[PDB]
Amino acid sequence: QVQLVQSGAEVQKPGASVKVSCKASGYTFASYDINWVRQATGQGLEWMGWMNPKTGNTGYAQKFQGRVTLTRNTSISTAYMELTSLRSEDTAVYYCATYRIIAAVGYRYFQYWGQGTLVTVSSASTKGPSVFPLAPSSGTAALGCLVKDYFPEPVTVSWNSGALTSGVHTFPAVLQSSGLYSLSSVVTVPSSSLGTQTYICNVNHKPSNTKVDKRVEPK
Amino acid sequence: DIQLTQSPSSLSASVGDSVTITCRASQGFGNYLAWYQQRPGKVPEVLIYAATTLQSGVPSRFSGSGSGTDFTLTISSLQPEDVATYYCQKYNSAPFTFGQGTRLEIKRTVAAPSVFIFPPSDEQLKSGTASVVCLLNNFYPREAKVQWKVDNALQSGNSQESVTEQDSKDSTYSLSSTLTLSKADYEKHKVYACEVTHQGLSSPVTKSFNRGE
Ligand SMILES: *[C@@H]1O[C@H](CO)[C@@H](O)[C@H](O)[C@H]1NC(C)=O
């Protein structure tokens, strides 16, 4: 079936430019426009532009013309989005999207979306997190992982390699005065399991190619 | 050409209730209007197209109506997992303008938080920093307050709170409060406590631990 897969999360400094990629599969890539949408920190979806892969013709929202270049490589079914003069205000999740795959006109609603690409505008350097255990005390027990001092967002936390999900709360990242992110991931489990059940948290930070696993034991 | 105005910007209703979102256009565009749901941490997903057509696989409680310049999204039987931001879009031609978005919350029955406290790990102390964590689990409504005490001295300026999105199954919130200290300060003092005030609690609930034990 149809799929759009985008490049990984990225950091770029003020005035620095960024290029995002969108590899398509499951349909004739050249026969349909690729549209680009963005969600800035505390904003709604913002349509940026459209690109025809056959001709390379482009169209942009007023807010974005002279700032965005849409290109493509038809041989590897890839669309690209280049954004120039990066400002604080351009920190956002960037999406590529395409129409429903149908012959007929008037179906140019965005049926398919890329997974999204977090782009962070800052002069701060990249850093992988330290993971610290949140050990159960003393029924229902709460335990977790403190994922501290990483940059940029995001991280993914999973429990026992996706095995454990019911009871999981991952908190949104908070930017400390240090200029680095910290979050916690917690899980409420039966008390009688700490003796027999193994609880590991898996933290993936892809901007630093970091993969940490922390075992959470009762102290 | 064609401005799109979405209302309300925020909404609160109970499970099994009926709610309505409004999209007004400044001009006709032949009813090429789509409705998208974006749930917390997910990519957008189309619900409605051509003003009134339900996308295949989308639950029956979703319905679009209107034409010309006045459009409506209705949810006839609200579920917990419908906590999301909703968007109207014109797709007649470029630009493919989005509405401002409408955020939906579930009003449910009051629930007190379960409070847990976590000492710093031996591991972290080697960095020179101690992070004490206070978990407030599974509470409603969203308004809560956390006050840190170190040997009964109330703390200020040295902590941060983070709230989860409304759970897509029980419609509750969770909150984390991190107290950040120097290693010198953390090993100076004995009794670490967080005091939680919430409308489901008759009086503040305190959780504490003694450094060492
Ligand atoms: C397309 O991509 C491949 C690399 O994967 C490269 O060899 C080729 O030069 C590219 N061609 C165009 C026209 O971009």
Residue numbers in the entry:
A (entry chain H): 1 to 52, 52A, 53 to 82, 82A, 82B, 82C, 83 to 100, 100A, ...
B (entry chain L): 1 to 213
Pull verbatim passages from the article behind this deposition.
The C1C2-specific DH677 memory B cell clonal lineage next was used to study affinity maturation and ontogeny of AIDSVAX B/E-induced ADCC responses. DH677.2, DH677.3, and DH677.4 clonal lineage members were isolated from PBMCs collected from the same vaccine recipient 2 weeks after the second boost with AIDSVAX B/E alone given in the RV305 clinical trial (RV305 group II).
We next determined the crystal structure of the antigen binding fragment (Fab) of the highest-ranking RV305 ADCC MAb, DH677.3, alone and in complex with clade AE gp12093TH057 coree plus the CD4-mimetic M48-U1. Conversely, RV305 boosting substantially increased ADCC breadth and potency (DH677.3 ADCC score, 4.56). That DH677.3 was better than A32 at mediating ADCC against HIV-1 clade B and C CD4 downmodulated cells makes this MAb an attractive candidate for targeting HIV-1-infected cells in vivo in the setting of HIV-1 infection.
